[PDB]
């Protein structure tokens, strides 16, 4: 059944699993027409498919051409997500195929179950966790490859950089969720915290700055403070 606070350690065991987030697949700008009606313009999206144990991110870029001449795009977006995840599983050698896929939104369950009928032993699960994967497009290098794509493209990243050399996958996932939660709550403030000291750079092969263990503790504190402030604002408490 559903992934929650109770069965959280299961994410970091030795059973291969992937999280799938579809919240950036179908993306639009809403604008006025000459006649003063409203219309949407699609922009490039992505499927966020993440191994929480290894940090391996399978970023399938969704080019705006996939929506051309299609109806009910928010519904199609769920099925296109399930098609691309199914294609990804089929492309992996048997020993690399996930035993579980956890969808971040319950609306993905039926589309993914139907696309994965050929894999009856792969469990498709919802989660009660409110994961901030929607903020993936606040990571500058992920945003850049999505917006520059001129065709459908899969790009592979490690969303943890080299953190697993120094910390466990539990701690790396906690750091990632806190960074993404901050970026989601106040993007400008989160990015200011990450880049304010110009002496700490992002390696060409990394997503996040090259913080020492001590600098990560300071960064993580600044992100928690950003999140609590913003909360007191939202809720006048």
């Amino acid at each position: 059944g559903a992934m929650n606070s109770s069965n959280y350690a299961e994410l970091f065991n030795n059973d291969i699993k992937l999280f799938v987030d579809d919240t950036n697949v179908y993306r639009v700008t809403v604008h006025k027409t000459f006649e003063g009606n409203v219309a949407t313009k699609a922009i490039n999206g992505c499927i966020f498919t993440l191994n929480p144990k290894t940090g391996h991110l399978f970023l399938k870029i969704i080019h705006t051409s996939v929506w051309a001449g299609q109806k009910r795009l928010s519904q199609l977006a769920k099925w296109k997500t399930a098609e691309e995840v199914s294609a990804l599983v089929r492309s992996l050698p048997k020993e690399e195929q996930p035993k579980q896929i956890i969808v971040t939104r319950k609306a993905m369950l039926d589309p993914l179950e139907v696309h994965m009928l050929d894999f009856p032993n792969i469990a498709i699960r919802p989660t009660e966790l409110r994961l901030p994967f929607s903020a993936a497009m606040s990571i500058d290098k992920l945003s850049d490859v999505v917006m520059k794509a001129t065709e459908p493209q899969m790009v592979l990243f490690n969303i943890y950089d080299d953190w697993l050399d120094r910390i466990s996958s539990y701690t790396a996932f906690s750091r990632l969720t806190l960074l993404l939660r901050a970026l989601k709550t106040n993007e400008e403030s989160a990015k200011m915290i990450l880049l304010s000291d110009p002496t700490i750079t992002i390696k060409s092969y990394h997503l996040w700055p090259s913080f020492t263990d001590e600098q990560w503790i300071t960064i993580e504190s600044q992100m928690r403070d950003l999140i609590l402030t913003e909360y007191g604002r939202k809720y006048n408490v």
């Binding site: 199609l76 589309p111 139907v114 696309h115 009928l117 050929d118």
Partner: protein
């Protein structure tokens, strides 16, 4: 007009014949049911006064043989049996009729209810769903599970309804996942109608049989089968016009006949709301929508 004689009635029991029912007292001189209309299947059903658990009964067609009921004190139930000796049977029935120890099948001349509930139901199809080939009649009860329920445990005592599963390779063509899941027309028309049932009459026959087993025995698996077969039609954008018109009549008579007090356990809220208000066929079941809105507006 055919007759199902009873050897005796040693235990107090409610006896059903089709949509009718009679209370019989322990050792009441009851010797059976006469004037049963030829041309239809019939069901004779039982609920013991001392154990209102296990409704059970027998589907039969009097054209296929001479049937009687005899209580078995070892197995503790009223059993259907075939009398192979024509003269012995005619002589038994004639005596019981002369002594007027039989109830008459109480059909009102105007009343087409039983025809309307059994229009497509045929004994030969019943005998493939309920397997016991040494008998020409079929036993069903409250607790019998379906082949589909068993997959998800005695195969001899199972209801072999056609398995319908919306999230199965059978239902979904590779490369047509979304199309086939949101519009079940290929599953209805190619897999089920052309492939398995051969025609709409056999499909409706199974649907009507599943309803009647749900209603007369509170058979849960039968209720699941009845709903799945309705939902497969209502979830198909492309259905022959004659099938939709016939489905509206079938369901109308089923909803008309259901006891008002059993709507809560025999009607699936999700399926009916989907079929009448969201599905492709939401505007194709006028008679059914009108009786459901007037009789069970709570469910909706």
């Amino acid at each position: 007009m055919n007759t199902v004689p009873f050897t005796s009635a040693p235990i107090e029991v409610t006896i059903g014949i089709d949509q009718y029912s009679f209370n019989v007292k322990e050792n009441q001189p009851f010797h059976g049911i006469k004037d049963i209309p030829i041309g239809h299947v019939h069901v004779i059903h039982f609920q013991h006064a001392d154990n209102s658990s296990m409704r059970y009964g027998y589907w039969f067609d009097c054209r296929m043989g001479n049937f009687y009921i005899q209580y078995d004190p070892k197995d503790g139930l009223y059993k259907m049996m075939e009398e192979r000796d024509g003269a012995k049977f005619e002589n038994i029935v004639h005596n019981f009729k002369e002594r007027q120890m039989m109830v008459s099948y109480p059909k009102i001349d105007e009343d087409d209810t039983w025809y309307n509930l059994t229009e497509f139901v045929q004994m030969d199809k019943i005998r493939k769903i309920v397997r016991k080939d040494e008998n020409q009649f079929s036993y069903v009860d409250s607790s019998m599970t379906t082949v589909q329920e068993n997959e998800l445990s005695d195969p001899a005592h199972s209801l072999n309804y056609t398995v319908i599963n919306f999230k199965s390779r059978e239902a979904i063509r590779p490369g047509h996942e979304m199309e086939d899941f949101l519009d079940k027309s290929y599953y209805l028309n190619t897999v089920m109608l052309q492939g398995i049932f051969k025609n709409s009459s056999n499909y409706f026959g199974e649907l009507q049989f599943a309803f009647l087993n749900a209603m007369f025995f509170g058979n849960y698996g039968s209720s699941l089968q009845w709903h799945a077969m309705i939902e497969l039609i209502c979830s198909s954008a492309t259905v022959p016009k004659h099938m939709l018109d016939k489905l509206d009549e079938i369901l109308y008579y089923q909803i008309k006949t259901l006891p008002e007090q059993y709507s809560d356990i025999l009607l699936n809220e999700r399926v009916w709301n989907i079929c009448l208000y969201s599905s492709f066929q939401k505007n194709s079941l006028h008679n059914t929508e009108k009786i459901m809105e007037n009789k069970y507006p709570e469910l909706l």
